[PDB]
Design an enzyme around this catalytic site. Structure first.
Site, PDB file in Angstrom:
ATOM      1  N   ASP A  11      59.797 -32.604   7.182  1.00 35.46           N
ATOM      2  CA  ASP A  11      61.071 -32.628   7.901  1.00 35.46           C
ATOM      3  C   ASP A  11      61.039 -33.630   9.053  1.00 35.46           C
ATOM      4  O   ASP A  11      59.989 -34.182   9.374  1.00 35.46           O
ATOM      5  CB  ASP A  11      61.630 -31.213   8.253  1.00 35.46           C
ATOM      6  CG  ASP A  11      60.923 -30.546   9.421  1.00 35.46           C
ATOM      7  OD1 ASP A  11      59.767 -30.892   9.701  1.00 35.46           O
ATOM      8  OD2 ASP A  11      61.531 -29.650  10.044  1.00 35.46           O
ATOM      9  N   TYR A  59      61.040 -35.421  12.761  1.00 33.29           N
ATOM     10  CA  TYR A  59      60.563 -35.086  14.100  1.00 33.29           C
ATOM     11  C   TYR A  59      61.648 -34.339  14.876  1.00 33.29           C
ATOM     12  O   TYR A  59      62.838 -34.648  14.753  1.00 33.29           O
ATOM     13  CB  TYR A  59      60.196 -36.364  14.848  1.00 33.29           C
ATOM     14  CG  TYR A  59      59.000 -37.100  14.286  1.00 33.29           C
ATOM     15  CD1 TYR A  59      57.718 -36.546  14.356  1.00 33.29           C
ATOM     16  CD2 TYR A  59      59.146 -38.348  13.695  1.00 33.29           C
ATOM     17  CE1 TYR A  59      56.613 -37.221  13.854  1.00 33.29           C
ATOM     18  CE2 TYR A  59      58.041 -39.031  13.187  1.00 33.29           C
ATOM     19  CZ  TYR A  59      56.780 -38.459  13.273  1.00 33.29           C
ATOM     20  OH  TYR A  59      55.662 -39.108  12.794  1.00 33.29           O
ATOM     21  N   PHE A  63      57.718 -40.165   8.816  1.00 30.96           N
ATOM     22  CA  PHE A  63      56.603 -40.662   9.671  1.00 30.96           C
ATOM     23  C   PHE A  63      56.945 -41.591  10.836  1.00 30.96           C
ATOM     24  O   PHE A  63      56.322 -41.504  11.895  1.00 30.96           O
ATOM     25  CB  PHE A  63      55.433 -41.227   8.824  1.00 30.96           C
ATOM     26  CG  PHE A  63      54.818 -40.187   7.932  1.00 30.96           C
ATOM     27  CD1 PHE A  63      53.951 -39.216   8.457  1.00 30.96           C
ATOM     28  CD2 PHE A  63      55.173 -40.115   6.583  1.00 30.96           C
ATOM     29  CE1 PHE A  63      53.423 -38.217   7.631  1.00 30.96           C
ATOM     30  CE2 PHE A  63      54.654 -39.119   5.771  1.00 30.96           C
ATOM     31  CZ  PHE A  63      53.776 -38.177   6.292  1.00 30.96           C
ATOM     32  N   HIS A 112      46.245 -34.714   4.412  1.00 37.71           N
ATOM     33  CA  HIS A 112      47.277 -35.141   5.349  1.00 37.71           C
ATOM     34  C   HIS A 112      46.686 -35.869   6.551  1.00 37.71           C
ATOM     35  O   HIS A 112      45.561 -35.567   6.954  1.00 37.71           O
ATOM     36  CB  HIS A 112      48.042 -33.902   5.794  1.00 37.71           C
ATOM     37  CG  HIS A 112      49.373 -34.191   6.453  1.00 37.71           C
ATOM     38  ND1 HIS A 112      49.494 -34.448   7.775  1.00 37.71           N
ATOM     39  CD2 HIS A 112      50.665 -34.230   5.926  1.00 37.71           C
ATOM     40  CE1 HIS A 112      50.797 -34.647   8.078  1.00 37.71           C
ATOM     41  NE2 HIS A 112      51.512 -34.509   6.946  1.00 37.71           N
TER      42      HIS A 112
HETATM   43 CL   LIG Z   1      45.746 -31.678   3.617  1.00 39.78          CL
END
Ligand SMILES: [Cl-]
Lengths: 223, 48, 53
Positions: free
Chosen positions: A63, A65, A76, A185
């Site tokens: 989602d 910021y 991002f 991530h």
């Molecule tokens: Cl991860």
């Protein structure tokens, strides 16, 4: 018509459906009554900057910021002039090791979008200071369909899937045609568990070159 | 499976302020942490 | 180190059989906290991170 032709020709049927009308009405109220990010004019910016025909690479986020001055309607990326959050700093650190790029004095990835990188979040709005507050309101239905139409595209797409939530979308992607680059991530909790050293940027460019496509110039220039 | 996340953050001017996030999975929390730009003074995770 | 801060971490954890227990960690860097989080296998009931003045 809310999107440029090449996207509209793939998605127009979704925007006519009851779930989208319900979402639109909720958002008209919430933008008027509280603080929603990104700015309403920016909600579809990833698709405005990167047409369906021009997509080369997709970088999936979750989602937007949730703080002032941050979200641009791109995964991002942040507006120039605000601090880069920790995951984005880690993206630039990996980019530096992989490609060699210096760390930029801002966190805007608009350059990438203009070169065919679709910076798609799966949820396109959020209430200020309340992460995941627009989860399950209709966006996931639409962004699943965006993934579907990209999967259906004849010309191959390179999907970069960072983290568990992004990797769940593998089931929607036809890997007989498309390419997947996946890792942990870039969040500080997981970056040193696979993301660092994964070289997603050079790998993406190598897939492009094999297809006779121009590579992405990943380096972000100071403002 | 679901968590509330509370953070005390400090901005560049030295002002400290709480943020309250509700009903996050651990995965959502890990992403939230990476999306937190100001200095973390305190963090609380509580299973709902 | 006069140029670095430390943190205290408290967790209330639950084991696979349902027993809840506290774990206390003192004098961690932020990076140490992140590594600790990743190395915690038991279920988190409560987690507290506090910067030490
Ligand atoms: Cl991860």
């Amino acid at each position: 018509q809310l999107l440029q032709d090449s996207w509209w020709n793939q998605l127009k049927e979704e925007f006519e459906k009851p779930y989208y009308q319900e979402l639109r009405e909720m958002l008209k109220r919430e933008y008027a009554e509280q603080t929603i990010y990104p700015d309403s004019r920016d909600i579809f910016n990833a698709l405005h900057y990167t047409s369906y025909d021009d997509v080369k690479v997709v970088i999936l986020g979750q989602d937007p910021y949730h703080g002032p001055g941050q979200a641009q309607g791109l995964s991002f990326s942040v507006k120039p002039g605000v601090k880069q959050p920790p995951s984005l700093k880690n993206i630039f650190l990996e980019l530096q090791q992989d490609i060699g790029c210096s760390i930029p004095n801002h966190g805007s990835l608009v350059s990438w979008a203009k070169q065919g990188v679709l910076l798609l979040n799966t949820v396109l709005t959020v209430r200020r200071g309340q992460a995941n507050s627009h989860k399950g309101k209709g966006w996931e239905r639409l962004t699943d369909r965006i993934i579907d139409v990209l999967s259906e595209r004849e010309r191959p797409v390179i999907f970069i899937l960072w983290g568990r939530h992004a990797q769940m979308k593998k089931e929607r992607i036809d890997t007989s045609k498309h390419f997947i680059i996946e890792s942990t991530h870039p969040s500080p909790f997981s970056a040193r568990n696979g993301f660092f050293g994964s070289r997603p940027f050079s790998r993406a460019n190598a897939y492009l070159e094999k297809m006779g496509e121009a590579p992405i110039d990943w380096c972000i220039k100071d403002l | 499976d679901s968590y509330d996340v509370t953070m005390l953050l400090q901005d560049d001017d030295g002002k400290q302020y709480y943020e309250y996030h509700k009903g996050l999975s651990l995965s959502d929390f890990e992403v939230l942490y990476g999306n937190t730009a100001d200095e973390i003074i305190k963090l609380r995770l509580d299973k709902v």
